[PDB]
Amino acid sequence: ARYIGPKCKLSRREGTDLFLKSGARALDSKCKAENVPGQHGQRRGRLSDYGLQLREKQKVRRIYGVLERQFRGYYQEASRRKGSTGENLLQLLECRLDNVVYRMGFGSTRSESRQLVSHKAITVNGQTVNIPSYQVKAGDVVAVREKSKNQLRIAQALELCGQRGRVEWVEVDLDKKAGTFKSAPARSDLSADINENLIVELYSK
Amino acid sequence: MVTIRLARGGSKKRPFYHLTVTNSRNARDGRFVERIGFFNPVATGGEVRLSVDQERATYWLGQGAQPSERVAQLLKDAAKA
Amino acid sequence: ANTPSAKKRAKQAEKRRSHNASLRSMVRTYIKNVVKAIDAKDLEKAQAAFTAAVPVIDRMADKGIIHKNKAARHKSRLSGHIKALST
RNA sequence: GAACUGAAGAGUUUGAUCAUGGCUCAGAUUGAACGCUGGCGGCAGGCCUAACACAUGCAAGUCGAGCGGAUGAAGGGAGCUUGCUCCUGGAUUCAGCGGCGGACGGGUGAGUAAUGCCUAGGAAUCUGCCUGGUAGUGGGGGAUAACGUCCGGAAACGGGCGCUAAUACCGCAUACGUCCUGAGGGAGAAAGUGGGGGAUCUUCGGACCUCACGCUAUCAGAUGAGCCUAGGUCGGAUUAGCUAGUUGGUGGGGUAAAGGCCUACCAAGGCGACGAUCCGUAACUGGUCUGAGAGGAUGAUCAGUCACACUGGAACUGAGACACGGUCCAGACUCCUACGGGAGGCAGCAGUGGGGAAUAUUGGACAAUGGGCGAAAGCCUGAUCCAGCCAUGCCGCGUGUGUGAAGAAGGUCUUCGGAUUGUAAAGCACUUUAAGUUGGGAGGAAGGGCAGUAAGUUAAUACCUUGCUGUUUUGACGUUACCAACAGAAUAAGCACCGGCUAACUUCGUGCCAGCAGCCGCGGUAAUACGAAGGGUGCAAGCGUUAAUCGGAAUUACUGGGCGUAAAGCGCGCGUAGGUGGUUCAGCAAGUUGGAUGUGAAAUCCCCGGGCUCAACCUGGGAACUGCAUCCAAAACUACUGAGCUA
Ligand SMILES: [Mg+2]
Ligand SMILES: [Mg+2]
Ligand SMILES: [Mg+2]
Ligand SMILES: [Mg+2]
Ligand SMILES: [Mg+2]
Ligand SMILES: [Mg+2]
Ligand SMILES: [Mg+2]
Ligand SMILES: [Mg+2]
Ligand SMILES: [Mg+2]
Ligand SMILES: [Mg+2]
Ligand SMILES: [Mg+2]
Ligand SMILES: [Mg+2]
Ligand SMILES: [Mg+2]
Ligand SMILES: [Mg+2]
Ligand SMILES: [Mg+2]
Ligand SMILES: [Mg+2]
Ligand SMILES: [Mg+2]
Ligand SMILES: [Mg+2]
Ligand SMILES: [Mg+2]
Ligand SMILES: [Mg+2]
Ligand SMILES: [Mg+2]
Ligand SMILES: [Mg+2]
Ligand SMILES: [Mg+2]
Ligand SMILES: [Mg+2]
Ligand SMILES: [Mg+2]
Ligand SMILES: [Mg+2]
Ligand SMILES: [Mg+2]
Ligand SMILES: [Mg+2]
Ligand SMILES: [Mg+2]
Ligand SMILES: [Mg+2]
Ligand SMILES: [Mg+2]
Ligand SMILES: [Mg+2]
Ligand SMILES: [Mg+2]
Ligand SMILES: [Mg+2]
Ligand SMILES: [Mg+2]
Ligand SMILES: [Mg+2]
Ligand SMILES: [Mg+2]
Ligand SMILES: [Mg+2]
Ligand SMILES: [Mg+2]
Ligand SMILES: [Mg+2]
Ligand SMILES: [Mg+2]
Ligand SMILES: [Mg+2]
Ligand SMILES: [Mg+2]
Ligand SMILES: [Mg+2]
Ligand SMILES: [Mg+2]
Ligand SMILES: [Mg+2]
Ligand SMILES: [Mg+2]
Ligand SMILES: [Mg+2]
Ligand SMILES: [Mg+2]
Ligand SMILES: [Mg+2]
Ligand SMILES: [Mg+2]
Ligand SMILES: [Mg+2]
Ligand SMILES: [Mg+2]
Ligand SMILES: [Mg+2]
Ligand SMILES: [Mg+2]
Secondary structure (H helix, E strand, C coil): CCCCCCCHHHHHHHHCCCCCCCCCCCCCCCCCCCCCCCCCCCCCCCCCHHHHHHHHHHHHHHHHCCHHHHHHHHHHHHHHHCCCCCHHHHHHHHCCCHHHHHHHCCCCCCHHHHHHHHHHCCCCCEEEECCCEEEEECCCEEECCCCCHHHHHHHHHHHHHHCCCCCCCCCCCCCCCCCCCCCCCCCCCCCCCCCCCCHHHHHHH | CEEEEEEEEEEECEEEEEEEEEECCCCCCCCCEEEEEECCCCCCCCCCCCEEHHHHHHHHHHHHCCCCCCCCCCCHHHHCC | CCCCCHHHHHHHHHHHHHHHHHHHHHHHHHHHHHHHHCCCCHHHHHHHHHHHHHHHHHHHHCCCCCCCCHHHHHHHHHHHHHHHHHH
């Protein structure tokens, strides 16, 4: 399904980046994002190993907005796939359609990217795809409808994402509102702070 | 007699047919002795419409096996190609 | 019965039984006469009974009342018994 | 080329410690049920208990190109008149005889511990419809149903008399194939219908030539079935002896076929601690769930085999039955009756009563794939294809989106300053997924008929067989999948938990009471454990609880444990079966090793692709199925054979 609720209470609990807003002003000066929520919030609360696994699994799930039946199916597929399942899980989870239409610069938030993809406003080769789970094969030209190219929400999201970094493996033409994926991202490409091995340790128990 | 007919695999409203050489007093998808090919009534994309094995079919006909009407039509159409 | 074809099959079956019984009795009669001819230790009447019994036995084997292997076995065994009696 | 790559521990005996040892927990799964709650779609699944009893409705018919009979149209003509009848004809329909099918498809798992199943084999058998060869389809007869007539009956109907048809039945005619008989000889069958026609005898009635179907005798091929041998198939020894048709032989009988399968004589044999007999329990397999593996549990869906059809027996019909909506006899239980006699079998599809924790509609159509019947139209099909109810399972999508500090009001706590629910709310501004409405809209559909044309068999432009051409022609699902537009954020979140194991705390109320609990355990007047509030944590159209299996459990230890004191060495010898065997030379080839060949059904598992917007799901190819059997080669070790040696 989907998650509805506060989008920074989660950040306050987790205490990390956890991209969940447009990023207009900042990440901090909205919710004092350094304390866990509720009355009992100032306590750091040193937590055991099981705490570590639960915390990072929730971190990845919340950043990528995936439910747990789907997430465990993803993990099983990654384990099936050869060659160091830890990064296979990340590579396979990255190729989701909604996260691609976000990272291609067409949406302000993951939730807004899902909003756009569900209401049948984005193409893959001209064919209507509206499942926010489609695994995009390398080569496909993800684009927005010729009808929808004049919507201003895409324009504002694009100008906001204009300054967020360059991934250096996709080839994007911005005038026509189209994307292109050449080959799957490497492990070094993604943020090398959260480790993949601790997840596979969690699911191996 | 022993006859060659169609066994209905696939899913609901998505047929698929195995060309089976079965004894006529058997179920539609019961025991058989050999399978010569298949017919796909949906095709689309890289899926092939029909394929059979010619030599085994000729052997079965040379042993006197009656093909059904639709099976006869499809086998003669394949023999055309 | 319930379906009329079942009734027709039934009545045709009693007709077929009342037919087949008489012919089975006839063949058994002929072989029995032959067997009691040999067992009585006489050759000429055994010859005559065998010659009068083979035609009906073979005609009945062909007619489909009994099976042909049975008729051939009867013929061979009775001929062997008579030939043994000949000495 | 790819077919796998995989193994976690925690709590609890003590004042504390190490070991042993049981209990409980974290995982994956169910044909599951219950409690709270509940939007949609796709694919699957759905009486596990009473093989308990059953109302009604449906689930096997078909052929007029087999046969009499009766229904006999349209008409070519006539009578009188406008209507009927009739001559000749004649398109439709079917009660009965006859030919196929009913032994398939469908259901259930009672029985069955071996006449079943699985693996490998082999010899003495049969087999309609199907295919390929070969040889023929000549001539007679006696009946009978229906049909009249009479008697009897409540009915199903029964009986007497008369007559008729055939592809119904039985003689007769011959034997390329067949059977027996030793050579010798002998024995054994046929049915004709429909479409055309050159010539001939003649009523081309018919004979004659051709084609189509059909019939007879036989060889072969498949397809299906029968029979035999070896190995494996649950627990119990608090079940140790079982068997007289029993074990073998001879003569005969019998079956399609080998056989004590049956019988009369001959002898006393046969099986068994490698578990016979007996008791309990149970369909078997491919496979399914777990596990790192070895193993452990199991046989829901789908497929192969077996058994049964209210209970117990028996045979007839046939190619095949001991016969699932066939027959006969007996029984139990419901029903009709004129009191003489009759009827029934939902373990076929819906349905009901009852049992239970618990499992659904008395729905559509032959449209498609198959089946039966016919030459062809076509009929029958609760098999099949689709619908209905059900959060039962798996997969997927929705309940929106950005900004938003006055950090708004209420609630909770407080150190009374403030914090917290919280960008959460309100406010501003955007899209229409799904559902709603309207309009477009494939694909499941092959084929069927009518006319022409060209090829082929005769002896023939005759029929017919075959190609093509042109015209016409069908859908239950179905308001299809799918597409487009429209208004409106509109319209759709719950459950468990928060002492440790295990992620998540404060206050109020009781005061060893009321209550909680998987294990340690909480509660007797500040309970993070009870009951409520706020606040959090975890899952999510679900969430928990119960019942069941494997894992963790190296806790039945082959892989992989132990026995001085934790449980565990017989009180001690001798010895049977069994297990094991110092050293040398040589042989053989059972074990052992390598290879080849046949099988290991399909599906499922694994790897690489294809299709439905992805997935679930469907599907191509490959891999695999460690198993089993038959051969070829080697000789180190074990076994077997022969000859030695002395530790
Ligand atoms: Mg879901
Ligand atoms: Mg004759
Ligand atoms: Mg005959
Ligand atoms: Mg203590
Ligand atoms: Mg201890
Ligand atoms: Mg009729
Ligand atoms: Mg069956
Ligand atoms: Mg049952
Ligand atoms: Mg027993
Ligand atoms: Mg006849
Ligand atoms: Mg055996
Ligand atoms: Mg005796
Ligand atoms: Mg003997
Ligand atoms: Mg004997
Ligand atoms: Mg025997
Ligand atoms: Mg025993
Ligand atoms: Mg069982
Ligand atoms: Mg039982
Ligand atoms: Mg069992
Ligand atoms: Mg059983
Ligand atoms: Mg597994
Ligand atoms: Mg283990
Ligand atoms: Mg069942
Ligand atoms: Mg089966
Ligand atoms: Mg039976
Ligand atoms: Mg019976
Ligand atoms: Mg009953
Ligand atoms: Mg009975
Ligand atoms: Mg018979
Ligand atoms: Mg029957
Ligand atoms: Mg019945
Ligand atoms: Mg039923
Ligand atoms: Mg009930
Ligand atoms: Mg009840
Ligand atoms: Mg059909
Ligand atoms: Mg009917
Ligand atoms: Mg559902
Ligand atoms: Mg429920
Ligand atoms: Mg904790
Ligand atoms: Mg509780
Ligand atoms: Mg208190
Ligand atoms: Mg409490
Ligand atoms: Mg174990
Ligand atoms: Mg256990
Ligand atoms: Mg021990
Ligand atoms: Mg002691
Ligand atoms: Mg001692
Ligand atoms: Mg002893
Ligand atoms: Mg001793
Ligand atoms: Mg010894
Ligand atoms: Mg030795
Ligand atoms: Mg020894
Ligand atoms: Mg070997
Ligand atoms: Mg297989
Ligand atoms: Mg050698």
